[PDB]
Amino acid sequence: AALTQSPVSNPVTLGTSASISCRSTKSLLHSNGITYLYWYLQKPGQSPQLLIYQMSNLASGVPNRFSSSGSGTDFTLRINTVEAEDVGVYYCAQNLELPPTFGAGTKLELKRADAAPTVSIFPPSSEQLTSGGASVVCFLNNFYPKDINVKWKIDGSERQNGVLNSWTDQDSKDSTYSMSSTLTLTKDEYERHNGYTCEATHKTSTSPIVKSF
């Protein structure tokens, strides 16, 4: 019994309804009249949360904006009046027979207005320096869409060697995206230069939001 869902939903406007499809290779409708399909939610950095079970029973705590309908083989999770906090990955699954099987999950995409990244660069801490290490960090927070590049310039030169980037999931309250960029290097190398620039080229303005020290 394989359950299949798409990896991403179409972008949804806050306040409007979202639909998440799911399909099973076998009918989940049991002779007792119950359809053994359940949905759970996985938010950024939290434990899975049951949403709906037996096709149309809400789990306590789950607001009635959530609902599920479908035949025995094709189902739809519906979320009306989508709120920013609804972001996350929705999984369908079946508990009709062994072995238990699960969908691959559908990430709810929330659409919103373009936003610029609030950049903030930081030089190696004194502590890290006393330990011989020297990493320069700069954040590019609360931007939209999640598309961006980031570029480092050491003393006016392009350095992409020891750079590591990390992106967060869509914010559950802001619907924006944030990213972290860290250029790690030896203290000896760090002192070998004086200027460090953090460049953030977002798909807006055409002009990069640079920051350096």
Next chain:
Amino acid sequence: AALLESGGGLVKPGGSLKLSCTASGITFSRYIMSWVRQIPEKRLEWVASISSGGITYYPDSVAGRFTISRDNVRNILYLQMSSLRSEDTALYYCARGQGRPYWGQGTLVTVSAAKTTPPSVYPAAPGCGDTTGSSVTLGCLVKGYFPESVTVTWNSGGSSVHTFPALLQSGLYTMSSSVTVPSSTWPSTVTCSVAHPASGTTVDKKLE
């Protein structure tokens, strides 16, 4: 009604570990109890099930290495793991899947050879010559730790927090966390609290 997994931890390849699960409001002996697991990559993986009649089911992936059992009197569910493999690393859940599914908070099982290490916390504060004042961006850099499971807290009251996923570098994990507040309150002590149980460590650094 609550299910509580326990017994997870760091174990060397080829090693063995026994997970247990207690419950409140659920009588294990009456259902098909199961164990499932999820690798951070996401998507649950069935690990084992045991029927009310005591029949055990296992997918090929663990077929002869894992043993699910149940103590009907003490109402405890067990998962005896052996010949542990790297691919077994994950968060393991105890679950009553029939009807309304119930599962625990989960227990982490790390199959590695690497030595566990506490995290090095470095404060990220505005240096000399930077746009500050109206809302400033502060943060803490956490690098040099192993058991990934690590949590950062800012005064226990943050809404403008941004915890970035940890990236593995040279065997060690590194993650950062940023916060933002107006300068009007800036001189009111900002402190980040990094917890890392797998090391029994908790580091706190007040920025500037």
